[PDB]
Amino acid sequence: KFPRVKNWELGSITYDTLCAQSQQDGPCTPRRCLGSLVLPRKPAEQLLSQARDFINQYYSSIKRSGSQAHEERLQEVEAEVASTGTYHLRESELVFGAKQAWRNAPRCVGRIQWGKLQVFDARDCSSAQEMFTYICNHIKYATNRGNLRSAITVFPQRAPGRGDFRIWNSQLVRYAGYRQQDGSVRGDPANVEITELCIQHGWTPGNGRFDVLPLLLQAPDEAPELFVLPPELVLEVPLEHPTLEWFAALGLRWYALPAVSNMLLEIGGLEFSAAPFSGWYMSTEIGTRDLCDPHRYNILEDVAVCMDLDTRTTSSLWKDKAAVEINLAVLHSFQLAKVTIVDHHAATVSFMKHLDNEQKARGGCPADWAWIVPPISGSLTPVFHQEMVNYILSPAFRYQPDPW
Amino acid sequence: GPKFPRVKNWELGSITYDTLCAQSQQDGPCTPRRCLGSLVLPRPAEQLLSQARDFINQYYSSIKRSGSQAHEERLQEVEAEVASTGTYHLRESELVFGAKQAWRNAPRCVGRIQWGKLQVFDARDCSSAQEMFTYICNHIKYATNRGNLRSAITVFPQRAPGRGDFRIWNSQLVRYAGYRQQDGSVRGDPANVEITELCIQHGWTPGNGRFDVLPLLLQAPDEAPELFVLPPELVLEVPLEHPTLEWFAALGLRWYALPAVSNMLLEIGGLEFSAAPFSGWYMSTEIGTRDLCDPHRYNILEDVAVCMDLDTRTTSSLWKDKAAVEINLAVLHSFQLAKVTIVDHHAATVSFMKHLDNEQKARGGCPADWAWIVPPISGSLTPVFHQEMVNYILSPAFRYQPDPW
Ligand code: HEM
Ligand code: HEM
Ligand SMILES: Cc1cc(N)nc(CCc2cc(N)cc(CCc3cc(C)cc(N)n3)c2)c1
Ligand SMILES: Cc1cc(N)nc(CCc2cc(N)cc(CCc3cc(C)cc(N)n3)c2)c1
Ligand SMILES: C[C@H](O)[C@H](O)[C@H]1CNc2nc(N)[nH]c(=O)c2N1
Ligand SMILES: C[C@H](O)[C@H](O)[C@H]1CNc2nc(N)[nH]c(=O)c2N1
Ligand SMILES: [Zn+2]
């Protein structure tokens, strides 16, 4: 009933009791595990019991569980749902909910920071114009001249009678991908489709490898609108290498701020279709995935040739050697430019501390092993040797369909 | 779409559906409420006969004689044997098919492209520990083939009703001793402290090195295990050196050629083979990353980084990643120089992708444990990282079994 969870490096055992609080089914069954899938295929009464559960979470968090303020808030929500089929969160509850969604996020290795999150309430937004202003403030706040600060901005919730507020971009800052005649891509191949949408909605495209995309913001039931981010708001870091001088000449660069803008924040049965959030990078995201993935910037071979490695055979481990230097260039360049970054060793070590904190606090912590273990040097980090239980707790970040 | 798991490769954008998981007759550890996929060990004549029938059906399908007289007659023969004895026995070619199918079905093995090429040694006539030793020595000689390694398995008699099991106490046929020191530390391989201490208790005179090959503790039914030293000339080892770092040879590191698992249960059609050691060749990351660099194993990362003169006082110099790469390169280079079969993690995972494609066409899927298939260094640099995988238990299977002590 309660899974035994072992660390194979240290020989220590815990039992996860938190997982019994999951009310939401994942993709696995006893016949087969689908834990490696990225996206698997998945009324008053239901809303009212999610609302109640969450309000119960909130009053318990402020050690006022059972008080008058608690009973009366439950009645307000009941009264509101029974009349209108929905209800609204107080700001303090929203702040609690956002932090809890982050805490509960099984694919996030940065969760030791969960208690430290700036929550901007943007639920009084009524136009794409206003959305843009809120997004510009978020970026300015979060960026903080390189001293990055975790933030979320929460736009108006989904409503039965109408379309969603949506940010069409997957991140607030992304580079364009331009499909060429010859079928190759100039820029970031992950972004070809959003780049084409921006052009279709009136953007004058660039022609570089690192052109920052405009935002396509959508107010309910209206065509999305295009807004260019003022270049001064978008902090970027040129990549150099500590010892390899030719590396700067690659002209490589990356932006400071990872800010997810296409996920749905669910709190107490309410759904927030636009709720972009940002922290700071772990270096492997840039060094290994963004720059080295074969379907991304795919620079490995170029770096290897510059390093004069033998690219003829896999057994020279030229790929591994080049990937290491690229990750080192990322860490050094962010450190030089005084922009917050964490390496995968420091990050996984802080995650292990988080696992221990959450064991004491809640009797468990949902974690997706495949996402927590970094994409290089897996077993050289302490998380490789740690068993993990994966389940869905609410409040939660979820995937949602693309608006187009 | 189709009512089967949809499986995506995120590098290539291609999709498949796994229909093979429909054949699974055994539950894994996951439920809709929680995924337990990362757990290393997840926790009568009626049951036997249905398992036997199933296996015999698998056999007759594979030789394209499904529904035939010979098929119906073998079915009849199996249930009559079970009806009078409680068990039955496999024909020789049924054992061959079953052993290969068990390797084919193993979700955690990246080497499965080779599955059809497995020498099956039938040792079901073995009746003593002395004879097990002879059989094991012959397996080692054949499998090692002076460096040109060959996949093999040796199968000892099956579990019987109210008779003891054949067991090899060692987890592998070749392992290094781990000696617990007075300071609490371990000289040798810390993974092998317990088996080393069992060998000593059973009369082995222990060495005092970092790479002492362990003796075999072999158990015939209802007898105490008996101790057997492998004659050194049979155990091929590879001294470790680096292609450009000249001091690496001075570390005195080495590893053995033959990875041979000896504590797993081979299950075929309800029958349980408690002693059935099998061997392949190494993937280089097994040695260079896990055996040598695991903090709870030889733990040599720091030593090697100091020699390379790296900054070991901070994580952001990536000293661990740099040392690990050179240790891995040294492993590959030394095996190559010594002419001993080895495969790097890039060639292995590329061949595994080919195997997934083969099995898609042959069987409509392939059970795979993502966390085990993706190598422990350079994960996303290999094609399997971007491949979604479905994990399920098919039979015939290799299973874990409790330690005999
Ligand atoms: C403070 C710095 C943070 C670091 C270093 C960090 C680290 C990471 C990493 C490495 C991933 C996997 C990224 C990928 O491979 O796509 C991730 C995922 C995720 N993080 Fe964080 N995180 C941070 C802050 C945050 C914040 C502030 C939130 C929200 C309030 C958050 C919520 C999430 C969610 C929902 C995912 C899963 C995204 C997906 O499924 O695509 N994290 N985190
Ligand atoms: C031919 C060369 C082979 C290669 C390169 C190879 C590769 C591997 C690797 C790297 C692992 C994971 C090892 C670990 O991290 O503990 C593994 C596991 C496994 N392989 Fe292979 N393999 C080969 C041959 C074989 C053979 C001949 C068999 C049996 C007939 C086999 C069956 C298994 C099984 C049952 C496991 C799971 C062990 C466990 O759960 O602890 N493989 N293989
Ligand atoms: C469209 C899409 C869907 C899906 N399931 N997975 C991806 C993978 C790529 C990716 C997508 C997003 N939206 C955000 C990140 C950064 C993740 C991140 C977030 C934060 C807050 C900090 C940090 N260091 N990294 C990476 C894309
Ligand atoms: C602590 C622990 C307990 C337990 N029961 N199982 C494990 C898994 C680790 C492992 C255990 C054994 N016995 C053999 C290998 C070599 C795997 C191998 C086999 C073959 C045949 C070829 C190859 N390249 N590698 C790996 C760990
Ligand atoms: C198929 C596989 O599950 C997929 O490639 C996952 C693996 N682990 C990951 N881990 C992180 N952090 N981010 C990812 O995008 C992925 N991709
Ligand atoms: C906790 C985790 O399940 C455990 O460390 C696994 C991860 N993947 C592995 N993969 C392989 N091939 N071998 C292993 O021993 C492990 N260990
Ligand atoms: Zn699962």
Tab-separated table of C-alpha atoms and ligand atoms in Angstrom, chain A residues 28-29 32-35, chain B residues 30 34-37, ligand 7:
chain	number	residue	atom	x	y	z
A	28	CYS	CA	0.493	3.451	-15.680
A	29	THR	CA	-1.424	0.262	-14.822
A	32	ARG	CA	2.416	-1.840	-18.149
A	33	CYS	CA	4.495	1.174	-17.059
A	34	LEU	CA	4.245	4.331	-19.194
A	35	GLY	CA	6.389	6.428	-16.852
B	30	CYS	CA	2.621	0.469	-11.075
B	34	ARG	CA	1.482	6.028	-8.742
B	35	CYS	CA	4.408	5.132	-10.940
B	36	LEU	CA	6.987	2.823	-9.357
B	37	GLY	CA	9.029	2.441	-12.540
C	7	ZN	ZN	5.065	3.362	-14.182
